[PDB]
Amino acid sequence: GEKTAGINVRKGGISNILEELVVQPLLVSVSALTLATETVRSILKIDDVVNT
Amino acid sequence: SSSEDEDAGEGISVNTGPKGVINDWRRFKQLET
Numbered sequence: 001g002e003k004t005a006g007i008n009v010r011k012g013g014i015s016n017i018l019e020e021l022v023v024q025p026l027l028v029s030v031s032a033l034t035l036a037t038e039t040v041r042s043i044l045k046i047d048d049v050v051n052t
Numbered sequence: 053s054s055s056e057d058e059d060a061g062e063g064i065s066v067n068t069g070p071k072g073v074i075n076d077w078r079r080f081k082q083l084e085t
Binding site: 050 | 066068070071
């Protein structure tokens with residue numbers, strides 16, 4: 001149930017990172033996930049390469 | 053006596069091989085240029 005448990009590089013283990021002030025905007029992870037999924041879907045619909 | 057004259061499928065359109073070999077192609081192409 002620890003929603004905000006992350007890798008604490010300073011402590012060297014696992015701990016709550018909101019106490020470490022390690023935060024990022026949502027439209028970084030969301031954008032990365034969306035764009036990566038779209039790119040993977042685009043690549044999966046490819047079955048040949050042609051040299052011009 | 054002794055004394056005498058004596059005394060099909062031509063169209064290939066290669067697909068990926070050029071991509072695989074472009075490293076060596078450019079390796080030779082730089083020196084050729």
